[PDB]
Every structure is written in C-alpha cells, then in structure tokens.
Amino acid sequence: DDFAYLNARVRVRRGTLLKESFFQEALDLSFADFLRLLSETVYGGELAGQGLPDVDRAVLRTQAKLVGDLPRLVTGEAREAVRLLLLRNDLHNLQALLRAKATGRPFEEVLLLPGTLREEVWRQAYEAQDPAGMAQVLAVPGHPLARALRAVLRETQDLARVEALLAKRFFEDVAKAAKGLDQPALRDYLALEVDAENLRTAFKLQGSGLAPDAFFLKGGRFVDRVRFARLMEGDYAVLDELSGTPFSGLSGVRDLKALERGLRCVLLKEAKKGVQDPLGVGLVLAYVKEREWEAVRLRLLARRAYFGLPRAQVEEEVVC
Amino acid sequence: MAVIADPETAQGFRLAGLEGYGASSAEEAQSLLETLVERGGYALVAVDEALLPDPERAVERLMRGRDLPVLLPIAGLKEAFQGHDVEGYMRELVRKTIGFDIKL
Amino acid sequence: AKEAYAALLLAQAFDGPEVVAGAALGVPPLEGVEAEVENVWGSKVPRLKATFPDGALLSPVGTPAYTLEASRAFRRYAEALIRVANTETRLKKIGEEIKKTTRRVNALEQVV
Numbered sequence A: 001d002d003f004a005y006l007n008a009r010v011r012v013r014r015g016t017l018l019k020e021s022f023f024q025e026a027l028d029l030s031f032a033d034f035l036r037l038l039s040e041t042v043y044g045g046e047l048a049g050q051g052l053p054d055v056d057r058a059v060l061r062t063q064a065k066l067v068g069d070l071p072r073l074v075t076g077e078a079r080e081a082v083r084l085l086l087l088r089n090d091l092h093n094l095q096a097l098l099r100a101k102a103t104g105r106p107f108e109e110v111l112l113l114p115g116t117l118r119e120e121v122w123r124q125a126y127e128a129q130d131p132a133g134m135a136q137v138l139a140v141p142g143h144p145l146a147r148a149l150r151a152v153l154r155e156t157q158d159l160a161r162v163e164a165l166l167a168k169r170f171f172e173d174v175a176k177a178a179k180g181l182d183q184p185a186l187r188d189y190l191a192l193e194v195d196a197e198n199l200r201t202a203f204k205l206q207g208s209g210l211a212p213d214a215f216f217l218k219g220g221r222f223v224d225r226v227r228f229a230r231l232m233e234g235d236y237a238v239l240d241e242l243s244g245t246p247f248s249g250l251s252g253v254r255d256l257k258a259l260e261r262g263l264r265c266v267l268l269k270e271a272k273k274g275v276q277d278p279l280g281v282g283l284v285l286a287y288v289k290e291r292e293w294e295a296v297r298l299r300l301l302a303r304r305a306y307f308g309l310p311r312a313q314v315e316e317e318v319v320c
Numbered sequence B: 001m002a003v004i005a006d007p008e009t010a011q012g013f014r015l016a017g018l019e020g021y022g023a024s025s026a027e028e029a030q031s032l033l034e035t036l037v038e039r040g041g042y043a044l045v046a047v048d049e050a051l052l053p054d055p056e057r058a059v060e061r062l063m064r065g066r067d068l069p070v071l072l073p074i075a076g077l078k079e080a081f082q083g084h085d086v087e088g089y090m091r092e093l094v095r096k097t098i099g100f101d102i103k104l
Numbered sequence C: 001a002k003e004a005y006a007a008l009l010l011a012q013a014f015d016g017p018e019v020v021a022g023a024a025l026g027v028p029p030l031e032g033v034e035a036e037v038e039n040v041w042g043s044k045v046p047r048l049k050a051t052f053p054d055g056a057l058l059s060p061v062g063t064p065a066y067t068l069e070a071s072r073a074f075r076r077y078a079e080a081l082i083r084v085a086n087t088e089t090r091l092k093k094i095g096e097e098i099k100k101t102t103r104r105v106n107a108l109e110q111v112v
Helices: A005-015 A020-027 A033-040 A042-046 A052-067 A077-083 A088-103 A119-124 A131-137 A144-152 A160-179 A186-204 A225-232 A256-276 A282-307 B007-016 B026-038 B057-062 B086-097 C002-014 C017-025 C066-111
Strands: B045-048 B071-074 C035-039 C044-048
Touching (some): A005 A282, A033 A052, A033 A282, A052 A282, A052 C017, A131 A144, A256 A282, A256 C002, A256 C066, A282 C002, C002 C066
Parallel strands (some): B045 B071
8 A cells, every 4th residue: 555665665675786787797707707796696695506597596586585575565556556567477377377277287397487376376276177266266356367367268168269368358457457547657657568569469470461450459559450450561661650659769670589679678768767756656666677677687697608608699688 | 309408408499399308417318318219209319419429329229220219419509609510520420431531 | 500599598588487488388299200211222211201280389479579489490490400310311321331332342352
C-alpha cells in the first residue's frame, strides 16, 4: 500500500548498483579478474566457486535475494501493481509447465526459475486432472496469469494453440490491468512493452505468411494494425514510419538481432524515465529493469570471459 | 544423432532437437561416447576436438562391424575463434588415409 | 558454426539460462535420420538423410526472441553437420579401397 516505505528500500537498493565503468573495465578480463571484481561485487556474495555455471547460479541467487523481496514486503493496490513487474519469469514457468504436461517429461525436467508464488504450488500443479483444476491450484488472488488461464481455459483440455492464445490473453489482461490502475507511467511503460512485443512477434513472424490479425494483439499505442500488416509484409518503411514515438532509432533495420537490441534499448530508455516518479511505483520498476540490464550485462560478461569473446564480438551489447 | 562437447555446447543442440551430452575430461568423453555407442543412437555422433581428437577408438573396439555410428571430430567454440585450421586437418586426414602427405 | 555459437551465446547472455533450458527441454521428436544405401566400388556405405522435425516447431508466438534465432541456427548447423558426415564417409571408403588395391597390387606382383 505505502508506495514510500518500499521506495526507501528501493532507493537503498538503487544505491547498490554498479556503474558503467564496472563493465567498461570488465571489457578486458580473463574470468579471474572478472571473478575478483565479482568478488568485490555484492552479487558475488553468493559466489560459490569457479566456472560459468556457478557464476550464473550465483547471479540467479543474487537476483532472488535483491529482486525477489520486491514481490513481498507489500500489500494492497501497491502489491497488485508491483506484482505485474516481475511477471515474465512466471509466465515462462507456466509455459514450461504446460509444455511439460502436454509433452510427458519429468516434473523435475525444467529447472523452474524463481518467480512470485510458491514453488511448492508449481510442484503440486504437476499432478492435476483438470486444466481448470490446475489453474485453481495455481490461483492467487492478484495473479493476472490465474485470471488469464482460466478465461483462456474454456476452449479444450490442453493445446499448444491454447498456450499461444493464453499468452495473447495474458498480454491482453496485463494491458487491461495496466489501464485499470491509478499509475500515470506504468500504463505507458506496459503499453510500450506491448507494442514492442507486437513488433517482436511481427519480426519473428515476418515472411511466415500466416494471418497477421490472428497474430496481432491489442493494447498498444505506437503502431497500427495496418502498420502491423505492413510489418508482416516485407516493408521496412513501416519501421521507418515510427517517428516521434519511442521507436526512434529503430529505422532502416531488417535483422531481428539488432532490431530487438534497439527495442530493448528504447525500452530501457523509457525505463530511465521512471526516476521522475519518486512517489509512485515506477521508480521501483526502473530499479527492477536496471537490475535486469545488469543481469543481461552480467551473463554477457560471464560468457565473454568464459569463452574468451572479442571486445568487438560484444561491442553491440553495451552501447546503451 | 548425438553430440558431445560441453553442457553449454550441448544445450544448443538440445535446442535444435538433437541429443546432447557433455564431458569436461577426455576419459568422461569416451565414457559418454561408450554410453551412446552401447545405447545405439540413430547413427550419428559428433565429438569436439578438444575432448577426443580422432574418436574412432570406441567404435573400432566395440562396433568394429557395420560402420554405423558415424564419428565426427567437430570443432569447439572457444577454439572456433581460430577455426580448426581446416587445411591442417585435411593434410592430417590424407596423411592418415593414404599415408602420403603432399601439397594441394 | 561461428554464426550459430554467436546466436547461442547471445540468447543465453541476454535471455536467462533457465528459460532457454525450459524452451529446449520442450522438444520436437528429435529423430528421423536414416542411413540409406550407397554403393561405391564393391561396398555399401551409409548415406544419412536429414532429421526433419523442423516442420513442427514450438511457440508460434515466440515468447523469447533471441532463443528462437538459436533454434533456427542449430538446424542449419546440424544440416551442415550431416552434409560433412555423408561426404567424409565416402572419402574414407575411397581412400582405404585405394590403399587396399595398392597392397593387393604389390602382394600379387612381388609374389605371383
């Protein structure tokens, strides 16, 4: 409820962040220098041993320690708001769970990264006869995925098209809840994420020839459904049509790698606008996205040091 | 099919829909090689160069006949900054094959 | 190889390790390769054909983005892999057939 008592610990955690020189000096290391610098870092407090997998497990434990508590320590409308910040890992865990239930591998098959609800609920959801019964076992009150999967659950028993339509309805109900809050910037950031995901589905499905209206979603403000069909066709001018919006530098690109790189750049730049709101909740969302950019930078530098990457090989990864 | 290089390498192949294994030591690489040879896997096995250079040994000891799990000394990615020295591999191959190394 | 390992490094760097484990444990049927017949100078040799579950791919709405580029990458990787396999096996058999002929020539000459 209190968007300030959490904001104080948010400012404290914002005080615990690495500078750009911490990665700029990390452009030249040999994973032992990187291990020593991470040993200086707070994320190396869970530093178990040596090796890339130990480094990634320590990074996941540090992310759970510094980022997982934000889902806790709050109650009310602020809890309903801050729940829809670290939601991608939860939807990914639910998607892997649906894939495992439809596939047939072991319930300990996927590694089940940390999200919002109890992992014991995810273990208990491995055994459920009805999909609606599994949804009710996974039903939290303010979980948007619980309301999304139940509404999408009135089609069949367990289908992959049900899973894709459930992801579409998940993004749709996320946009509906983002419109259904008293937050001036969280709705804008969620809508920017929705339009970027629409562009990402368009670039991933460009040339597929499928139905774009079945692929296009609702909730954005930066593009059009006709612009969506133009992006579905081989027309980069629609990507050039993005002028004045946050999709500014996204122009003249056809390769999806640098396209989604600049998309993440625009998303992080919009997330940088969250420091303007010291009283609401978007500052905490900015802190979460900052830890996310730090996490991408950490696993990137970890891969670079473990495989000996060139500085030119990852030069397009720290430009913003 | 199947490959063995490294868990970080093998998870890309498992993402291809292709059976992966991964061993840090060369003896464990022949162990996993022996595993998929005894569990005769669809006839192809790729092996990284860094673990086994010429991995013919397990199949010539075990499956001397039938030529079936085809071996490949594939290149590893931390070494694929160099690019295997493909010409030197080919020289080594013809010298192994017909004995007589010459210049192409 | 260099393009596919680059795509895999980028997808595991940016997107999480656990989610690429989760998207890769969900599997296409992975099989389909077969060792069909080739006949080269008195010897059948196995010529492999492709795997082909690539008509059946997961996540039509690709929920990660850089990971699906790696799932597209390692199919081209495995295809170039089986091409190298069913060229090098022919080269093996031709080379050893030849050196067999030379040892039969020298045996036949210097004895009979």
